[PDB]
């Protein structure tokens, strides 16, 4: 039965049994460790609701979706074979009560379980778009299809820490030296260097570097960071956990293959993986052989505790937090700063910190704050006990909320010192309790496994463990999806080599037909929208873009005869862009939408599906009935203020729907102006901005990132609102209205956005402190509501002063 592992390997894209690039058994130990959590979740998941995976939420239905309901009545069409009967229902009615199993027409999605109909996400999607709810009375799918295949005390050691640097070796290439840091978090506890030697293919020192920290004082999670400098500049780094996965001090002989720089806060610097490219890479050879507080002080403490996660703590600040430890422990918000005040290189202090962690009643009772929780999972905390109280708060997240934060919870595994962590186990568990979570976990993990040498090993092990409990059907499903993207990526990569396009449109359609009759299956799940199953290509409709990167525009029939639309499923396949950056930005746009929802604001963003599948390669969802702003301008002029406004007119049939497009545009434009300004990606050329035929503006192509402009509010955009250089219409006054409310609604979650932005830069954008601290300024940290309002409207006006000037400057450049 070893062909089951051979399968797993294929689904993963990496061989987890391979021990060709290890120097201990941490990886294998983690495989065995993950068995128990897997089975606990497997054995306790409800077979029925696992099969139907109701996508559901406990959040209230917002004001904007209440005022679309006809007096406590919502209509639901029901279909049998050629039947279409229409039942009246109240929002509070259950799938039990409305039944006089309802599956959604066209989709692999179910309205089942003890939930009111207003709390299913598919229902809310229908109310939002103005659409009506269509269902079939189907049999429940068989849970048997989901069957899972049958399976000296260290504190008595006063001697100083030392490491022997024997030397470095490189096959091919002034002078060079080795720096050896004892690190915890991004914090250097102790640092020693060698003397400089000439930089030859082999350099030997044969020297003991004796550190000032005692062996009894090395905290668990401490890394020996070995770096190589020339002159100075950093050229190579590698890490080694000083305390291993069995709580044993690391001992003996090491030859570690190192990573090279160029291609500084970057998550790759932290990895404990060695370079597997044994043949080209630099190696290093080492030997380990070993009353209560008064008023002004409270106010000073409260001011420290109130500051944003990127406000630096002085030595003075840290000393106050530590001395007033127990007062600080009463404020959940103090936690990141308090634990950044611990001297982790002193055992007796660490011990006190653990006694502090045992008194966390207020923490245990606090309401879940995701922003505060994520801060404890970032690069500044390497202690397992601190990180675990963060994961403990995650456990109360309902499934709707896991999905919102999933991409960034997977990225934050990169800040774990060990492969087996409470965070890895939380992701395993939540993924096996819910198919939608599991589907996306598969692809987020696979995305990293296929292109990150620094972390593929760790992520591979987590994914295997997921796959061994997701059950036979999901396995079949995953296999099918992977086969299709490998076929389609091949075709994408081949067409590209044949570089508008004449004999290429011939070649493309030949190859598609060739795949259609031969390799491509009956049907497959769309990776970015797991409820849709695509069938056979519409070869007629597929094309390649007049473009440097030559992406494929592909269109598919729907495999599901119960579907009530004729619409096709459109997927773009592209090589050339780093789509990891796009995934992170689009997910942050979804988080921004859910923030706005909490304050009854809809800004109609359009965060389309995107999945990185490999090195500079992946897929993008085709938004139907949409074109670019640049193209709309080419059409009428060959820049003019009015062309967008009457493009919108000629697509709207009735005056009823035109005005609807204009308002939808005012909202859309508001959302993207605020969102892009906060993320510092607002200055775009307008062939990276799109609009639907129904007025929904949306930015695209985020994985790319002179005079400046904060965002895009051009005269064509302004003209749709009714403003001509220096005027102010009703619709423009409303745009300002919405921008201001949207901006202030994001500032109420300042800490959350700062941590997500920080993490984003570090794990998906090869970064300095200067880069990270943009969003502080963008969110006008420290300022009041009225002063922030003035800031943003000044930005709105900075766009007005420039009209077309950056657009044209882009025109010349590009
Ligand atoms: C720029 C435009 N982008 C998107 N179009 C539709 N949905 C999307 N989702 C994300 N990006 C797009 C686009 C991408 C293409 C990719 C491959 C092949 C072709 Cl022919 C592409 N064409 C466009 C495009 C360009 C102008 C107008 C238009 F409707 C589409």
From Swiss-Prot:
<dbReference type="GO" id="GO:0043303">
    <property type="term" value="P:mast cell degranulation"/>
</dbReference>
<dbReference type="InterPro" id="IPR000403">
    <property type="entry name" value="PI3/4_kinase_cat_dom"/>
</dbReference>
<dbReference type="InterPro" id="IPR016024">
    <property type="entry name" value="ARM-type_fold"/>
</dbReference>
<dbReference type="InterPro" id="IPR011009">
    <property type="entry name" value="Kinase-like_dom_sf"/>
</dbReference>
<feature type="domain" description="PI3K-RBD">
    <location>
        <begin position="71"/>
        <end position="139"/>
    </location>
</feature>
<feature type="binding site">
    <location>
        <begin position="605"/>
        <end position="613"/>
    </location>
    <ligand>
        <name>ATP</name>
    </ligand>
</feature>
<dbReference type="GO" id="GO:0006955">
    <property type="term" value="P:immune response"/>
</dbReference>
<dbReference type="GO" id="GO:0005944">
    <property type="term" value="C:phosphatidylinositol 3-kinase complex, class IB"/>
</dbReference>
<dbReference type="GO" id="GO:0004674">
    <property type="term" value="F:protein serine/threonine kinase activity"/>
</dbReference>
<dbReference type="InterPro" id="IPR045580">
    <property type="entry name" value="PIK3CG_ABD"/>
</dbReference>
<dbReference type="GO" id="GO:0002675">
    <property type="term" value="P:positive regulation of acute inflammatory response"/>
</dbReference>
<dbReference type="GO" id="GO:0006897">
    <property type="term" value="P:endocytosis"/>
</dbReference>
<dbReference type="Pfam" id="PF00613">
    <property type="entry name" value="PI3Ka"/>
</dbReference>
<dbReference type="InterPro" id="IPR035892">
    <property type="entry name" value="C2_domain_sf"/>
</dbReference>
<feature type="modified residue" description="Phosphothreonine; by PKA">
    <location>
        <position position="750"/>
    </location>
</feature>
<keyword id="KW-0808">Transferase</keyword>
<dbReference type="GO" id="GO:0006954">
    <property type="term" value="P:inflammatory response"/>
</dbReference>
<keyword id="KW-0443">Lipid metabolism</keyword>
<feature type="region of interest" description="Catalytic loop">
    <location>
        <begin position="680"/>
        <end position="688"/>
    </location>
</feature>
<dbReference type="GO" id="GO:0045765">
    <property type="term" value="P:regulation of angiogenesis"/>
</dbReference>
<dbReference type="GO" id="GO:0048015">
    <property type="term" value="P:phosphatidylinositol-mediated signaling"/>
</dbReference>
<keyword id="KW-0254">Endocytosis</keyword>
<keyword id="KW-0225">Disease variant</keyword>
<keyword id="KW-0395">Inflammatory response</keyword>
<dbReference type="GO" id="GO:0001819">
    <property type="term" value="P:positive regulation of cytokine production"/>
</dbReference>
<dbReference type="InterPro" id="IPR000341">
    <property type="entry name" value="PI3K_Ras-bd_dom"/>
</dbReference>
<dbReference type="InterPro" id="IPR003113">
    <property type="entry name" value="PI3K_ABD"/>
</dbReference>
<dbReference type="GO" id="GO:0055118">
    <property type="term" value="P:negative regulation of cardiac muscle contraction"/>
</dbReference>
<dbReference type="GO" id="GO:0072672">
    <property type="term" value="P:neutrophil extravasation"/>
</dbReference>
<dbReference type="GO" id="GO:0045087">
    <property type="term" value="P:innate immune response"/>
</dbReference>
<dbReference type="GO" id="GO:0005829">
    <property type="term" value="C:cytosol"/>
</dbReference>
<dbReference type="GO" id="GO:0002250">
    <property type="term" value="P:adaptive immune response"/>
</dbReference>
<keyword id="KW-0145">Chemotaxis</keyword>
<dbReference type="GO" id="GO:0043491">
    <property type="term" value="P:phosphatidylinositol 3-kinase/protein kinase B signal transduction"/>
</dbReference>
<dbReference type="InterPro" id="IPR018936">
    <property type="entry name" value="PI3/4_kinase_CS"/>
</dbReference>
<dbReference type="Pfam" id="PF00454">
    <property type="entry name" value="PI3_PI4_kinase"/>
</dbReference>
<dbReference type="GO" id="GO:0051897">
    <property type="term" value="P:positive regulation of phosphatidylinositol 3-kinase/protein kinase B signal transduction"/>
</dbReference>
<dbReference type="GO" id="GO:0016477">
    <property type="term" value="P:cell migration"/>
</dbReference>
<dbReference type="GO" id="GO:0007204">
    <property type="term" value="P:positive regulation of cytosolic calcium ion concentration"/>
</dbReference>
<dbReference type="InterPro" id="IPR042236">
    <property type="entry name" value="PI3K_accessory_sf"/>
</dbReference>
<dbReference type="InterPro" id="IPR036940">
    <property type="entry name" value="PI3/4_kinase_cat_sf"/>
</dbReference>
<keyword id="KW-0391">Immunity</keyword>
């Amino acid at each position: 039965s070893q062909a089951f592992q051979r399968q797993l390997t294929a689904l993963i894209g990496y061989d987890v049994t391979d021990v060709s690039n290890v120097h201990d058994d941490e990886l294998e130990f983690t495989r065995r460790g993950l068995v128990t959590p897997r089975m606990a979740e497997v054995a306790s998941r409800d077979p029925k609701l696992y099969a139907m995976h109701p996508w559901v939420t406990s959040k209230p239905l917002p004001e904007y979706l209440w005022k679309k309901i006809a007096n406590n009545c919502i209509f639901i069409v029901i279909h049998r074979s050629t039947t279409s009967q229409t039942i009246k229902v109240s929002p509070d009615d259950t799938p039990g009560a409305i039944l006089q199993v309802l599956r959604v027409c066209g989709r692999d999605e179910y309205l089942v379980g003890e939930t009111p109909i207003k709390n299913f996400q598919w229902v809310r999607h229908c109310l939002k778009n103005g659409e009506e709810i269509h269902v079939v009375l189907d049999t429940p799918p068989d849970p048997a299809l989901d069957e899972v295949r049958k399976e000296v005390s260290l504190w008595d050691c006063d001697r100083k820490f030392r490491v022997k640097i024997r030397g470095i070796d490189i096959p091919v290439l002034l002078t060079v030296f080795v720096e050896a840091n004892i690190q915890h978090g991004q914090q250097v506890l102790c640092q020693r260097r060698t003397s400089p030697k000439p930089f030859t293919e082999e350099v030997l020192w044969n020297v003991w570097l004796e550190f000032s920290i005692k062996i009894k004082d090395l905290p668990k999670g401490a890394l020996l960071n070995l770096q190589i400098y020339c002159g100075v500049q950093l050229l190579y780094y590698v890490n080694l956990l000083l305390i291993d996965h069995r709580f044993l001090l690391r001992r003996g002989e090491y030859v570690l293959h190192m990573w090279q720089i160029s291609g500084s806060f970057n998550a790759d610097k932290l990895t404990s993986a060695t370079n597997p490219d044994k043949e080209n890479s630099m190696s290093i050879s080492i030997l380990l052989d070993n009353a209560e507080m008064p008023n002004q002080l409270r106010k000073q403490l409260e001011a420290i505790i109130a500051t944003d996660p990127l406000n630096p703590l002085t030595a003075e600040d840290k000393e106050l937090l530590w001395h007033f430890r127990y007062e600080s422990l009463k404020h959940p918000k103090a936690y990141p700063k308090l634990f950044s005040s611990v001297k982790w290189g002193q055992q007796e202090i660490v011990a006190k910190t653990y006694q502090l962690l045992a008194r966390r009643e207020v923490w245990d009772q606090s309401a879940l704050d995701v922003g505060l929780t994520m801060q404890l999972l970032d690069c500044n905390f390497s202690d397992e006990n601190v990180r675990a109280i963060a994961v403990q708060k995650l456990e109360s997240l309902e499934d709707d909320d896991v999905l919102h934060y999933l991409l960034q919870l997977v990225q934050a595994v990169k800040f774990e010192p060990y492969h087996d962590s409470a965070l890895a186990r939380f992701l395993l568990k939540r993924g096996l309790r819910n198919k939608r979570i599991g589907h996306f976990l598969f692809w987020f993990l696979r995305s990293e496994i296929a292109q990150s040498r620094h972390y593929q090993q760790r992520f591979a092990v987590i994914l295997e463990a997921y796959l061994r409990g997701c059950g036979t059907a999901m396995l079949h499903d995953f296999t099918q999806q992977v086969q299709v993207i490998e076929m389609l990526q091949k075709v994408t990569l081949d067409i590209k080599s044949l570089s508008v396009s004449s004999q290429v449109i011939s070649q493309l359609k030949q190859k598609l037909e060739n795949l259609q009759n031969s390799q491509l299956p009956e049907s497959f799940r769309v990776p970015y929208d797991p409820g849709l199953k695509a069938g056979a290509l519409a070869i007629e409709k597929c094309k390649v873009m007049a473009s440097k990167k030559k992406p494929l525009w592909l269109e598919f029939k729907c495999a599901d005869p119960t579907a009530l639309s004729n619409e096709t499923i459109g997927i773009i396949f592209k090589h050339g862009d780093d789509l990891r950056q796009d995934m992170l930005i689009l997910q942050i746009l979804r988080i921004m939408e859910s923030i706005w929802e909490t304050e009854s604001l809809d800004l109609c963003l359009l965060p389309y599906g995107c999945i990185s599948t490999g090195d500079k390669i992946g897929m993008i969802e085709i938004v139907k009935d949409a074109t670019t702003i640049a193209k709309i301008q080419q059409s009428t002029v060959g820049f003019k203020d009015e062309v967008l406004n009457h493009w919108l007119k000629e697509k709207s049939p009735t005056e009823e729907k035109f005005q609807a497009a204009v308002e939808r545009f005012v909202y859309s434009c508001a959302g993207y102006c605020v969102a892009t300004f906060v993320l510092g990606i607002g200055d775009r050329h307008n062939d990276n901005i799109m609009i639907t035929e129904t007025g929904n503006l949306f930015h695209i192509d985020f994985g790319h990132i002179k005079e400046r402009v904060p965002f895009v509010l051009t005269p064509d955009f302004l003209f749709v609102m009714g403003t001509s250089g220096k005027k102010t219409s009703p619709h423009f006054q409303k745009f300002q209205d919405i921008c201001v409310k949207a901006y202030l609604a994001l500032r109420h979650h300042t800490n959350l956005l700062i941590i997500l932005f920080s993490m984003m830069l570090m794990t998906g954008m090869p970064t300095s402190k200067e880069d990270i601290e943009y969003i502080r300024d963008a969110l006008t940290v420290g300022k009041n509501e009225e002063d922030a309002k003035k800031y943003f409207l000044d930005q709105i006006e900075v766009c007005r002063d420039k009209g077309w000037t950056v657009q044209f400057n882009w025109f010349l450049h590009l």
